[PDB]
Design an enzyme around this catalytic site. Structure first.
Site, mmCIF file in Angstrom:
data_model
loop_
_atom_site.group_PDB
_atom_site.id
_atom_site.type_symbol
_atom_site.label_atom_id
_atom_site.label_comp_id
_atom_site.label_asym_id
_atom_site.label_seq_id
_atom_site.Cartn_x
_atom_site.Cartn_y
_atom_site.Cartn_z
ATOM 1 N N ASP B 66 65.985 28.601 47.015
ATOM 2 C CA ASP B 66 65.416 27.532 47.833
ATOM 3 C C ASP B 66 65.830 27.622 49.304
ATOM 4 O O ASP B 66 65.029 27.290 50.188
ATOM 5 C CB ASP B 66 65.790 26.170 47.256
ATOM 6 C CG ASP B 66 65.202 25.024 48.049
ATOM 7 O OD1 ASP B 66 63.967 24.806 47.979
ATOM 8 O OD2 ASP B 66 65.972 24.334 48.748
ATOM 9 N N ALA B 67 67.061 28.055 49.598
ATOM 10 C CA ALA B 67 67.448 28.230 50.998
ATOM 11 C C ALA B 67 66.661 29.364 51.647
ATOM 12 O O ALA B 67 66.245 29.253 52.806
ATOM 13 C CB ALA B 67 68.950 28.491 51.113
ATOM 14 N N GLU B 142 41.372 27.674 40.671
ATOM 15 C CA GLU B 142 40.266 28.609 40.476
ATOM 16 C C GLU B 142 39.919 28.737 38.989
ATOM 17 O O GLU B 142 40.324 29.711 38.348
ATOM 18 C CB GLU B 142 40.644 30.011 41.106
ATOM 19 C CG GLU B 142 40.948 29.874 42.573
ATOM 20 C CD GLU B 142 41.583 31.077 43.216
ATOM 21 O OE1 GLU B 142 41.295 32.234 42.823
ATOM 22 O OE2 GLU B 142 42.355 30.838 44.170
ATOM 23 N N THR B 211 34.260 33.801 50.197
ATOM 24 C CA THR B 211 33.063 34.635 50.307
ATOM 25 C C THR B 211 33.439 36.109 50.473
ATOM 26 O O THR B 211 33.111 36.773 51.453
ATOM 27 C CB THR B 211 32.204 34.134 51.454
ATOM 28 O OG1 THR B 211 33.058 33.708 52.534
ATOM 29 C CG2 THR B 211 31.362 32.944 50.969
ATOM 30 N N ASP B 213 35.163 39.548 47.618
ATOM 31 C CA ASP B 213 35.189 40.000 46.222
ATOM 32 C C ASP B 213 33.838 39.758 45.540
ATOM 33 O O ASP B 213 33.769 39.579 44.321
ATOM 34 C CB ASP B 213 36.309 39.327 45.410
ATOM 35 C CG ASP B 213 37.716 39.816 45.782
ATOM 36 O OD1 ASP B 213 37.883 40.925 46.339
ATOM 37 O OD2 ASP B 213 38.675 39.072 45.502
ATOM 38 N N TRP B 401 41.929 36.294 54.090
ATOM 39 C CA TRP B 401 42.964 36.750 53.182
ATOM 40 C C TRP B 401 43.187 38.238 53.440
ATOM 41 O O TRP B 401 42.287 39.050 53.192
ATOM 42 C CB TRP B 401 42.533 36.509 51.732
ATOM 43 C CG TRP B 401 43.479 37.128 50.735
ATOM 44 C CD1 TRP B 401 43.416 38.390 50.205
ATOM 45 C CD2 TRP B 401 44.633 36.503 50.154
ATOM 46 N NE1 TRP B 401 44.469 38.591 49.330
ATOM 47 C CE2 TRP B 401 45.228 37.447 49.284
ATOM 48 C CE3 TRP B 401 45.229 35.243 50.303
ATOM 49 C CZ2 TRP B 401 46.387 37.163 48.546
ATOM 50 C CZ3 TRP B 401 46.377 34.962 49.572
ATOM 51 C CH2 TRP B 401 46.944 35.922 48.704
HETATM 52 C C1 LIG Z 1 35.849 37.985 41.832
HETATM 53 C C2 LIG Z 1 36.846 38.976 41.231
HETATM 54 C C3 LIG Z 1 38.042 39.344 41.916
HETATM 55 C C4 LIG Z 1 38.964 40.275 41.318
HETATM 56 C C5 LIG Z 1 38.674 40.813 40.069
HETATM 57 N N1 LIG Z 1 37.493 40.460 39.392
HETATM 58 C C6 LIG Z 1 37.173 40.988 38.135
HETATM 59 O O1 LIG Z 1 38.028 41.895 37.516
HETATM 60 C C7 LIG Z 1 35.943 40.590 37.474
HETATM 61 C C8 LIG Z 1 35.565 41.066 36.228
HETATM 62 C C9 LIG Z 1 34.375 40.680 35.636
HETATM 63 C C10 LIG Z 1 33.885 41.151 34.251
HETATM 64 O O2 LIG Z 1 33.057 40.487 33.713
HETATM 65 N N2 LIG Z 1 34.347 42.314 33.502
HETATM 66 C C11 LIG Z 1 35.322 43.323 33.880
HETATM 67 C C12 LIG Z 1 36.745 42.905 33.516
HETATM 68 C C13 LIG Z 1 34.911 44.569 33.098
HETATM 69 C C14 LIG Z 1 33.967 44.456 32.124
HETATM 70 C C15 LIG Z 1 33.586 45.581 31.410
HETATM 71 C C16 LIG Z 1 34.195 46.822 31.720
HETATM 72 N N3 LIG Z 1 35.129 46.889 32.703
HETATM 73 C C17 LIG Z 1 35.459 45.786 33.357
HETATM 74 C C18 LIG Z 1 33.612 39.765 36.348
HETATM 75 N N4 LIG Z 1 32.362 39.295 35.789
HETATM 76 N N5 LIG Z 1 33.981 39.307 37.530
HETATM 77 C C19 LIG Z 1 35.112 39.700 38.099
HETATM 78 N N6 LIG Z 1 35.421 39.180 39.327
HETATM 79 C C20 LIG Z 1 36.591 39.536 39.996
HETATM 80 C C1 LIG Z 2 39.558 39.212 36.346
HETATM 81 C C2 LIG Z 2 38.733 38.260 37.208
HETATM 82 C C3 LIG Z 2 37.472 37.764 36.758
HETATM 83 C C4 LIG Z 2 36.704 36.861 37.569
HETATM 84 C C5 LIG Z 2 37.216 36.482 38.797
HETATM 85 N N1 LIG Z 2 38.456 36.958 39.248
HETATM 86 C C6 LIG Z 2 38.969 36.574 40.484
HETATM 87 O O1 LIG Z 2 38.236 35.700 41.279
HETATM 88 C C7 LIG Z 2 40.253 37.084 40.928
HETATM 89 C C8 LIG Z 2 40.835 36.754 42.150
HETATM 90 C C9 LIG Z 2 42.071 37.276 42.503
HETATM 91 C C10 LIG Z 2 42.746 36.978 43.838
HETATM 92 O O2 LIG Z 2 43.925 37.064 43.958
HETATM 93 N N2 LIG Z 2 41.899 36.648 44.965
HETATM 94 C C11 LIG Z 2 42.463 36.402 46.278
HETATM 95 C C12 LIG Z 2 41.496 36.996 47.296
HETATM 96 C C13 LIG Z 2 42.703 34.915 46.566
HETATM 97 C C14 LIG Z 2 42.994 34.516 47.823
HETATM 98 C C15 LIG Z 2 43.237 33.182 48.102
HETATM 99 C C16 LIG Z 2 43.181 32.245 47.049
HETATM 100 N N3 LIG Z 2 42.893 32.696 45.802
HETATM 101 C C17 LIG Z 2 42.664 33.980 45.581
HETATM 102 C C18 LIG Z 2 42.675 38.139 41.603
HETATM 103 N N4 LIG Z 2 43.963 38.721 41.936
HETATM 104 N N5 LIG Z 2 42.113 38.441 40.452
HETATM 105 C C19 LIG Z 2 40.937 37.939 40.103
HETATM 106 N N6 LIG Z 2 40.430 38.321 38.896
HETATM 107 C C20 LIG Z 2 39.201 37.855 38.441
#
Ligand SMILES: Cc1cccn2c(=O)c3cc(C(=O)N[C@@H](C)c4cccnc4)c(N)nc3nc12
Ligand SMILES: Cc1cccn2c(=O)c3cc(C(=O)N[C@@H](C)c4cccnc4)c(N)nc3nc12
Ligand SMILES: Cc1cccn2c(=O)c3cc(C(=O)N[C@@H](C)c4cccnc4)c(N)nc3nc12
Lengths: 496, 496
Positions: B66-67, B142, B211, B213, B401
């Site tokens: 915490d510090a 989220e 907006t 990824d 970000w």
């Molecule tokens: C917005 C975002 C940020 C970071 C990571 N993200 C994902 O990893 C992701 C995954 C899927 C998904 O459906 N399938 C993946 C796991 C898949 C399926 C089949 C074979 N290999 C991989 C998805 N719809 N949105 C996704 N959005 C994000």
């Molecule tokens: C697997 C999967 C499926 C669908 C959506 N997904 C995501 O939307 C996602 C987002 C992040 C993440 O960190 N995004 C950053 C930019 C962020 C910045 C500020 C506030 N919040 C988030 C993450 N590491 N994995 C993610 N995986 C998925």
């Protein structure tokens, strides 16, 4: 259980006031023409029409001679001597009284407005029923609009409560008092109350679908007025139900209500079965005992699907009675409608009509090549397919408008009774054809399916199927971490 | 009104506990990298991430020294000496803590459930804010699901009340405490809460849209992760908003949510503006300071919109560290993500990468011809179009970000500040191109229209326009005798 056979007996006020069983020029179809044999072929006669007056009570037309009206009704209820299952209903409403622009329309809107008005209106229905000796109440409001529907339902529930009490009080357990309505048989008017069908039909014994007048002179193209199934060569229509106040999602609306679609009897029935809580046994299919005539039709396809020059106006705004051979069109000053009885006589009168058959819609039609005329109607042959559809779909039965339009032998009524009840009639091989079926799917007619139970904590891919709360659900896109019913990602696709 | 420039400062718990400003291998981006110049270019820094614990209170990671945490935060709030407008927010949540399958998700769901739990959670947020010296609260859940949204909304309202009182108590009228949330930037997660955007945004100063990824290895085809506008040659996606629980008709859903559609920054912004009660001034556009790489693209057009061999699992399951030049890819053991800083050093160091430009999406991308590589990212040129879009659409500003991913000179942040505030930058002639715009129409972007008043008792044809109770309506079919709004036949198309 026996299929209902519900025949309308319509008699105008001037014919009540001058009633006689001996002169077909003032009363064309007196009660006398309902022989004991025809009474046995009916399960219900809907005496029609009464109205709602400005006192917001059920009432006869003010010009009715009440003494003569009681005598007409007494002749009808006397037919119960020949058929112990027969009910003489009375019908409140009809197009003339109750349509949006009708003379009494506001009285329908106001009678269902408040708990006091509904209580009062319901009492008056049961009082009219008991005072004149009727066996039940039929409401033909054409049609309540969305914001009036909840009041409509509560009035029907109020009538149901009083009729069930009256049944017990009168010892009528063997033939309980009944409550029915005439329902829209086409999507445009049905969309007014479609979303609340389940609550509308709950207090009813039957909903009688007006599955006729699906074509007329108000449409630019001639068409069949009671096609069982669709013909790809004919006109199609906007599916108004996708705009009903359902609250469903885009996928759910789209798979229930394809647009455009074929305005058919099958479409109307399937659209009712698509709603949860609407039992098939309460749905009654209406059929017409009359034809609709068009003029100015072109050739090639027998007058089907042709432009025309028929006035759509009401009343008929002319003195040109162009339906050749139709004496009753002159007597009634309208060439655009003919009873089955009259059409039969036009056929066997060498007036140049040809009787054709559309094997898709499973309905007959007349073509006049000389004068360019087209008549859409039903007959004993089209009733074979409609009767088989009623049995296959486990509907409650059949309704028709109206008894005075059958031929003198009662052939159309005898055919309906034959197809339901005759031991020596066999339709197991009747070919229902390749006409277009209505393919919509809704919550009430979902297919039976199996799927692994949903597992909380699982991530599902697009298109996965699970079972949950008694339904099978499909994911619409990928990476689904929510439960069916908890999130827009899941589509209900099957039951059990 | 000065546009917001909101930069996330993300530091993991291990780096907080080991914080040092003289060893990049333990803390790659110490606060001392944020010079007075950069402090003046920001309006907000979102220190991230805090959490919600099992006591349903806002809390630091329990393993946080915490510090050491107070020291890191003090280094941020010290920056306010150089910029009297700067605010150090803290962010609760993030993907790892708050996604459906994340470790703390149940704490978010349960904290917002009742009035007592919401009051306890909100009190904790303000206590943490005052204890550590923050200037406001940012919630990055989220994402709440449809049944949780009302409780989420009430918790935000409760935080807002406590912040406004704290502003008074501390004499902070000149720099009032603020409340923001991170919002989904794509329709799939947006659909969870879309229908309640108005009540969600009411207690906020800003909703920061993520907006970016919008493309990644998890999709079957390479694409830009933050396209401003759409490219017809690019992939399109299911418009999940058409499945949200809005209660709209088929025509209304179809016109608001074209499908398939181009998943773009413009789409997300216009989707928010379609909803009544969402003011553009609260919408903040997120941009990435990082790129996403694909391994195995075919040739053709810079590797845009082709197949690939990139794994989509997290953690990165494998070991082929194949993004060459990218040394932080080894340090962080994942080749699919590279900071702008690193992407810049790759373009400097003779590794075969080519920088190309898509003038529809207004974004850059890298193509590698030999190893078959594609990288989608943003740079100072793409930020010109996004900054102009922010000004033209009257949005609240920009969020990014994250701060540690800019280059050492801070060029990306400096470019954003320049495009909003520099008197010697002039984008008046910057051509926004012909990329696909999102053209859905909803309640919040209904046009002014003019039509003769609805007249009761008249029958309207199909396509008639009338004005009634504040809106202009159009009939969807003919022979309309009902009043608008009271029916299925009438479509709202404009405002009076
Ligand atoms: C917005 C975002 C940020 C970071 C990571 N993200 C994902 O990893 C992701 C995954 C899927 C998904 O459906 N399938 C993946 C796991 C898949 C399926 C089949 C074979 N290999 C991989 C998805 N719809 N949105 C996704 N959005 C994000
Ligand atoms: C697997 C999967 C499926 C669908 C959506 N997904 C995501 O939307 C996602 C987002 C992040 C993440 O960190 N995004 C950053 C930019 C962020 C910045 C500020 C506030 N919040 C988030 C993450 N590491 N994995 C993610 N995986 C998925
Ligand atoms: C102009 C117009 C537009 C739209 C719909 N329309 C009708 O649905 C309609 C119906 C009738 C009518 O009486 N049908 C008989 C069979 C009937 C039998 C039992 C109970 N109700 C009715 C009618 N004469 N004109 C009508 N005109 C229109």
């Amino acid at each position: 259980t026996r299929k209902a056979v519900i025949g309308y007996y319509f008699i105008p006020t001037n014919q009540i006031n001058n009633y006689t069983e001996t002169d077909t020029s003032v009363v064309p179809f007196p009660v006398s023409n309902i022989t004991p044999a025809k009474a046995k072929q009916l399960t219900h006669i809907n005496f029609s029409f009464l109205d709602i007056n400005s006192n917001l009570e059920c009432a006869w037309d003010p010009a009715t001679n009440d003494a003569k009206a009681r005598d007409v009704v007494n002749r009808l209820t006397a037919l119960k001597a020949h058929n112990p299952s027969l009910r003489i209903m009375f019908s409140i409403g009809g197009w003339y009284y109750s349509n949006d622009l009708g003379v009494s329309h506001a009285n329908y809107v106001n009678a269902v407005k408040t708990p006091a008005s509904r209580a009062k209106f319901a009492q008056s229905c049961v009082r009219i029923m008991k005072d004149y000796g009727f066996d039940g109440v039929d409401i033909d409001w054409e049609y309540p609009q969305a914001a009036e529907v909840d009041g409509f339902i509560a009035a029907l529930q109020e009538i149901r409560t009083l009729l069930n009490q009256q049944t017990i009080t009168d010892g009528r357990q063997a033939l309980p008092y009944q409550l029915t309505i005439a329902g829209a048989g086409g999507a445009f008017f049905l969309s007014r109350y479609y979303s609340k069908l389940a609550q509308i039909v709950a207090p009813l014994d039957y909903i009688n679908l007006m599955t006729y007048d699906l074509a007329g002179p108000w449409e630019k193209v001639t068409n069949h007025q009671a096609a069982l199934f669709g013909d790809a060569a004919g006109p199609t229509f906007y599916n108004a139900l996708r705009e009903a106040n359902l609250g469903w999602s885009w996928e759910e609306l789209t798979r229930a209500f394809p647009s455009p679609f074929s305005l058919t009897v099958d479409a109307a029935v399937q659209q009712h079965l698509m709603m949860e809580g609407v039992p098939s046994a309460k749905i009654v299919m209406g059929v017409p005992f009359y034809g609709r005539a068009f003029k100015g039709v072109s050739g090639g396809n027998g007058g089907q699907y042709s432009s025309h020059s028929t006035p759509g106006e009401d009343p008929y705004p002319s003195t040109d009675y162009w339906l050749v051979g139709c004496e009753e069109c002159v007597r009634d000053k309208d060439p655009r409608i003919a009873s089955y009885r009259q059409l039969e006589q036009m056929l066997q009168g060498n007036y140049g009509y040809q009787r054709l058959w559309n094997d898709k819609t499973k309905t007959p039609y007349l073509y006049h090549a000389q004068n360019e005329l087209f008549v859409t109607y039903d007959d004993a042959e089209s009733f074979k397919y409609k009767a088989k559809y009623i049995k296959q779909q486990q509907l409650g039965g059949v309704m028709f408008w109206h008894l005075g339009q059958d031929n003198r032998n009662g052939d159309l009524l005898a055919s309906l009774d034959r197809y339901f009840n005759a031991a020596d009639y066999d339709d197991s091989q009747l070919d229902m054809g390749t006409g277009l079926r209505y393919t919509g799917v809704g919550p009430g007619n979902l297919p039976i399916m199996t799927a692994p139970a949903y597992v909380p904590g699982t991530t599902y891919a697009q298109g996965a199927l699970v079972s949950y709360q008694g339904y099978v659900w499909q994911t619409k896109w990928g990476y689904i971490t929510s439960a069916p019913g908890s999130d827009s990602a899941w589509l209900k696709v099957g039951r059990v």
